[PDB]
Amino acid sequence: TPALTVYLDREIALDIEKAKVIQSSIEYTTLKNVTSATEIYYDPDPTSTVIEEDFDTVEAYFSQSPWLLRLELDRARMLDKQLTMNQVADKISEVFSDDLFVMWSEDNADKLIIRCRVIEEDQMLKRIEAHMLDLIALRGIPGISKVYMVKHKVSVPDESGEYKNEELWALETDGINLAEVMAVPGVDSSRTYSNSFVEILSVLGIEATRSSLYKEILNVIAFDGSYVNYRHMALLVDVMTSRGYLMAITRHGINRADTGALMRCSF
């Protein structure tokens, strides 16, 4: 269960609108997540079409290969994620150049339809569709599937000197991507914590990896109400973080030491 606990700034943690905006900008969204249906049509006339549903649309918009890729999107998915047709068209164009036409329909229509034309090609269109439904990314950080808005109660000293509980808004993002999340504007790039120490060792360092490991061990110990002294966990996290890298508690990290052979062969 990889998860990142992102903390927001002070001017943002007390606002739900800015927090929701940051969550929407951080959440990963691709074309496959918003695509509802895809179809392949044979349109020999580039200026007209055979389908009577998109007749008045193309006849008002207009005023190569005959194959046409017609993709119908979901209105609820495009409305909840706050995504428009212009942004999707621009994101498709920025990666397709002039090798694929893009014709989008208005939002006031009954169905969100997008037509594409290519300026033996039977399986080529299927391959192009499979490549589009696996690489076209709209917005967001890659690796962030779901985002949850959590309320954190922090004991802050008041202006008079007394500690009081303050409720702030933080984010919990599924997946691991600290290097790309820390660089997001409006995100506190000094308090973001990650549950995976492997990525911490590569992003921050070994000193932060030791603290993350100690925090994880303390949480695992105290989840069931048990309590263990700090010296034991400190020695445990210092032994694993002695050679500079993460040393496992298996035959790969223990037997790879400069100790005696009689001691290493006893495990």
Which positions touch other proteins (CB under 8 A)? Answer: 32, 35-44, 50-51, 66, 74, 122, 125-126, 129-130, 133-134, 146, 148-149, 179-180, 182-183, 185, 189-193, 200, 202-208, 211-212, 230-231, 234-236, 238-239, 241-245, 249-250, 254, 257-260, 263, 265-267
User: β-strand 163-174 against 35-42: which pairing, if any?
Assistant: unpaired
Q: Strand order of the sheet with strand 147-157?
A: 147-157, 163-174, 3-7, 193-194
Which residue, 15 or 129, is less far from other proteins as judged by CB? 129
Which residue, 109 or 248, is less far from other proteins as judged by CB? 248
Which residue, 166 or 174, is less far from other proteins as judged by CB? 174
Find out whether 4 and 172 touch, Cβ atoms under 8 Å: yes
Cβ contacts of residue 12 below 8 Å, gap of 6+? 18, 19, 22, 169, 186
Which residue, 56 or 172, is less far from other proteins as judged by CB? 172
For 58, the token pair is 């193309």
Q: How near is the Cβ of 44 to other proteins at its closest, in Å?
A: 5
Q: Strand locations in 52-135, DSSP E?
A: 67-73, 103-104, 113-117
Q: How near is the Cβ of 253 to other proteins at its closest, in Å?
A: 9
Q: How near is the Cβ of 20 to other proteins at its closest, in Å?
A: 13
Residue 31 has phi, psi (to 5 degrees) of: -70, -30
Which residue, 60 or 261, is less far from other proteins as judged by CB? 261
